[PDB]
């Protein structure tokens, strides 16, 4: 199940309008309180007019609207189930503006929801863009609108939340499709659950930022239920999904052909492991005792060229284990892995002990010292985040998490780790005064300007429960070594939530739950628009445009020349990300040194070390003097 974020508004004085309604299935049958009566558009003798179909409500009075619910027909028939939809709010019933929520609902008879940020309105409109099974009709058994206890206008300069993207699944795992710019998401064998899996199936859903279209696909070709996996984007640009519900499987997503290809089985069966793309384009993985059994799972490496997995038994997992109360089942999970120089992989945590992993021969491991500062030794930070915001300077920001995976208090601990050469112990310091809010199960992304956006989580880790939620996101600004609170949201994002940086510079935050009959399933996502996209007047700022690029494929050490429509002051390369269970080993940022050729013509060199400039797809962002970024131009980097 799921749940609304607000309280049901009294429907006694409501006036409703529908584009069409069959006799016996009147527009008002959707607000009569009878679950067995429904509104249904024209059919039979009246003909079968295709979508869009609309349901408009006049609430007579202004309400602080934060959602709606839609109960479909409960008679066992599927005709009219709403698929793609849009929700609009208004104060006059004439001017509707932009949708406060849009997307698609799953094809079943369960109550569907649209949860969004509070907005005062008198009129509500639900537009059915498509029927769930492509049929011409629209039907609704019961429709309700919800309200918050109050409304507080967002603070100027602290970004904005909205709109909500309604989904047919809980997006517990996600990635940005490089060549299409779409957000790929997946759950498990079911749209709302993972338990009781027969294996061999994954339900996926994609959202296109340019069209707003949500599409789905059931993946069975790879014979893999991709829930709880390791995720990496290889040197060629294929998404390598490993283990999970089907512990020994590897599934490959190809962006260019928009298809899933069967990959080679891993040498060891794993679940909850972290995988990381290397300097040579290969993928390294270690640990992962959630599935496949609880035992010593050392490293192994994937080669995209030969489509093989090879064991690296001497790349020992023992040095990176946390002291989790639940033991090995949890202690080898979600390592903070980063591909580095000469085929090495840095492990920043969650364990206090940081390590260097080597991939030559049968593998090796070397101690990199303990994550610490002048404030003391950092405790184990399970499900804490780690973000490489400046790969050129080897800067990694780590924050949050708890000593144990569950039933443990999260902390405000935050550190800055500075990587040097492989085998050397990196210098580590405390980041500012730490987080404003202690949190675990939170997610994060590095933004074009080098700042790190942190959102969601809870003060005490209790998987599948929406207790002690943190609604206020935080942004770390490196130049000032300061954290800044942003405008809060209204949807709890805890266990099974994700965050990814979109090609337009905004943040996609969603998921949470995936517990079947629980009421904590969140079949949605929200868009966060950072302050850098707004001008002083509170309106969306004019963005600089990249009018031309010399090439879209470059080798490390190579140069790229661009043309713009206006003057730019700064530029950066951000590697496309992947995300699940707080892990994102693909994203990283490279600040660029620009050469002004005169006028609106610029050049830059991609770092020569492929350990810094990890091969694969990257987003090119250019910022003007005001700090407003352009939309991303896609660049492929090779070693």
Query: Which parts of this chain interact with Cu ion (CB under 5 A)?
Result: 228
Specify the residue, 184 or 228, whose C-beta has the smaller distance to Cu ion: 228
Specify the residue, 383 or 445, whose C-beta has the smaller distance to Cu ion: 383
Give dist(CA 534, CA 531) in Å, integer: 5
Give dist(CA 71, CA 140) in Å, integer: 6
Instruction: Please confirm, yes or no, whether 495 is among the known catalytic residues.
Output: yes
**E strands within 101-249?**
101-104, 112-128, 139-140, 142-147, 160-166, 173-177, 182-186, 202-207, 214-219, 230-233, 238-242
Which is the catalytic residue, given 123, 405, 495, 576?
A: 495
Residue 417 CB, shortest distance to Cu ion, in Å, is: 26
What DSSP element (H or E) covers 251?
strand 250-254
Residue 405 CB, shortest distance to Cu ion, in Å, is: 10
Give me the count of residues in the chain. Answer: 639
Residue 329 CB, shortest distance to Cu ion, in Å, is: 12
The closest alpha carbon to 611, from 438, 373, 384, 422, belongs to 422
Give dist(CA 546, CA 624) in Å, integer: 11
Q: Is 496 annotated as a binding residue?
A: yes
For 341, the 3-state DSSP assignment is helix
Residue 244 CB, shortest distance to Cu ion, in Å, is: 9
Tally Cβ neighbours within 10 Å of residue 461.
Answer: 26
Q: Is 113 annotated as a binding residue?
A: no
Residue 457 CB, shortest distance to Cu ion, in Å, is: 15
Specify the residue, 2 or 633, whose C-beta has the smaller distance to Cu ion: 2
Two tokens at 214?
């949500």
Please, what sign has the CA dihedral across residues 78, 83, 89, 94? negative
**CB of 620 within 8 A of CB of 632?**
yes
User: What distance lies between CA 296 and its chain's CA centroid?
Assistant: 30
Residue 583: partners with Cβ closer than 8 Å, 6 or more residues away:
231, 274, 334
For 107, the 3-state DSSP assignment is coil
What DSSP element (H or E) covers 306?
none
For 619, the 3-state DSSP assignment is strand
Specify the residue, 165 or 228, whose C-beta has the smaller distance to Cu ion: 228
**CB of 30 within 8 A of CB of 142?**
yes
Residue 274 CB, shortest distance to Cu ion, in Å, is: 13
Specify the residue, 70 or 228, whose C-beta has the smaller distance to Cu ion: 228
Residue 493 CB, shortest distance to Cu ion, in Å, is: 14
Chain breaks in the chain (C to N over 2.5 A) after: none
Residue 12: partners with Cβ closer than 8 Å, 6 or more residues away:
none
Q: Is 581 annotated as a binding residue?
A: yes
Give dist(CA 633, CA 628) in Å, integer: 15
**CB of 565 within 8 A of CB of 545?**
yes
Q: Which residue is nearest to Cu ion (CB)?
A: 228
Residue 228 CB, shortest distance to Cu ion, in Å, is: 5
Specify the residue, 496 or 543, whose C-beta has the smaller distance to Cu ion: 496
What angle is formed at CA 344 by the lines to CA 260 and CA 552, rounded to 5 degrees? Answer: 50
Tally Cβ neighbours within 10 Å of residue 566.
Answer: 15
Q: Is 495 annotated as a binding residue?
A: yes
Specify the residue, 121 or 228, whose C-beta has the smaller distance to Cu ion: 228
Specify the residue, 228 or 592, whose C-beta has the smaller distance to Cu ion: 228
Residue 127: partners with Cβ closer than 8 Å, 6 or more residues away:
52, 53, 54, 55, 85, 86, 87, 88
For 263, the 3-state DSSP assignment is coil
Q: Which residues are catalytic?
A: 495
From the annotation, which residues make up the binding site?
Answer: 272, 495-496, 581
Residues making up the binding site for Cu cation: 272, 495-496, 581
């Amino acid at each position: 199940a799921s749940a609304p974020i607000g309280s049901a508004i009294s429907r006694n004085n409501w006036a409703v309008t529908c584009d069409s309604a069959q006799s016996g299935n009147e527009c008002n049958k959707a607000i009569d309180g009878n679950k067995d009566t429904f509104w249904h558009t024209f059919y039979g003798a009246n003909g079968d007019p295709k979508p869009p179909h609309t349901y408009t409500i006049d609430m007579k009075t202004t309400q602080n609207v934060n959602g709606l619910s839609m109960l479909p027909r409960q008679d066992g028939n599927q005709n009219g189930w709403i698929g793609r939809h849009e929700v609009y709010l208004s104060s006059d019933g004439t001017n509707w503006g932009s949708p406060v929520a849009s997307g698609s609902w799953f094809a079943d008879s369960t109550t569907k929801y649209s949860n969004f940020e509070t907005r005062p309105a008198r009129y509500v409109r639900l537009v059915a863009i498509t029927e769930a099974n492509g049929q011409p009709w629209t039907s609704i058994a019961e429709i309700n609108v919800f309200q918050a206890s109050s409304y507080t206008a967002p603070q100027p300069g602290l970004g904005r939340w909205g709109p909500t993207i309604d989904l047919p699944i809980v997006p517990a795992a996600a990635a940005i499709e490089p060549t299409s710019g779409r957000v790929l998401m997946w759950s498990s064998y079911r749209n709302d659950a993972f338990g009781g899996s027969p294996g061999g199936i994954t339900l996926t859903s994609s959202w296109d930022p340019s069209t707003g279209i949500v599409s789905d696909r059931t993946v069975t070709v790879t014979k893999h239920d991709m829930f709880c996996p390791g995720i990496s984007m290889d040197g060629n640009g294929q998404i390598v999904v490993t283990g999970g519900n089907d512990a020994k499987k590897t599934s490959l997503y190809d962006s260019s052909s928009d298809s899933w290809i069967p990959g080679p089985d891993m040498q060891v069966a794993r679940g909850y492991q972290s995988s990381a793309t290397m300097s040579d384009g290969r993928v390294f993985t270690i640990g992962g005792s959630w599935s496949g059994g609880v035992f010593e799972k050392n490293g192994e490496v994937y080669s995209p060229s030969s489509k093989t997995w090879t064991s690296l038994p001497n790349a020992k997992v023992n040095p990176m284990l946390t002291a989790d109360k639940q033991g090995l089942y949890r202690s080898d999970n979600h390592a903070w892995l980063f591909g580095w120089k000469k085929g090495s992989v840095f492990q920043a945590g969650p364990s206090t002990a940081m390590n260097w992993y080597y991939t030559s021969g049968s593998g090796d491991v070397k101690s990199a010292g303990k994550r610490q500062s002048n404030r003391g030794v950092a405790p184990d930070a399970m499900c804490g985040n780690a973000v490489m915001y400046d790969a050129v300077k080897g800067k990694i920001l780590t924050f949050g998490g708890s000593p144990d995976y569950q039933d443990s208090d999260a902390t405000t601990n935050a550190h800055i780790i500075t990587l040097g050469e492989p085998g050397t112990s990196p210098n580590t310091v405390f980041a500012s005064n730490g987080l404003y809010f202690a949190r675990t199960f939170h997610t994060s992304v590095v933004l074009p300007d080098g700042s790190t956006f942190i959102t969601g989580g809870q003060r005490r880790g209790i998987p599948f429960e929406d207790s002690t939620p943190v609604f206020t996101p935080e942004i770390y600004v490196p130049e000032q070594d300061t954290f800044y609170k942003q405008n809060p949201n209204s949807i709890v994002r805890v266990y099974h939530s994700i965050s990814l940086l979109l090609p337009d510079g905004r943040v996609f935050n969603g998921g949470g739950g995936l517990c079947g009959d629980c009421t904590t399933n969140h079949f949605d996502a929200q868009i966060f628009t950072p302050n850098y996209l707004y001008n002083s007047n509170g309106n969306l700022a004019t963005r600089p445009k990249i009018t031309r690029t010399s090439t879209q494929s470059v080798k490390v050490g190579g140069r790229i020349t661009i043309s713009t429509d206006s003057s730019i002051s700064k530029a950066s390369l951000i590697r496309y990300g992947t995300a699940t269970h707080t892990v994102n080993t693909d994203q990283r940022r490279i600040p660029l040194t620009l050469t002004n050729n005169g006028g609106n013509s610029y050049s830059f060199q991609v770092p020569s070390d492929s350990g810094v400039a990890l091969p694969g797809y990257w987003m090119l962002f250019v910022m003007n003097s005001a700090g407003v970024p352009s939309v991303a131009s896609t660049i492929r980097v090779t070693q």
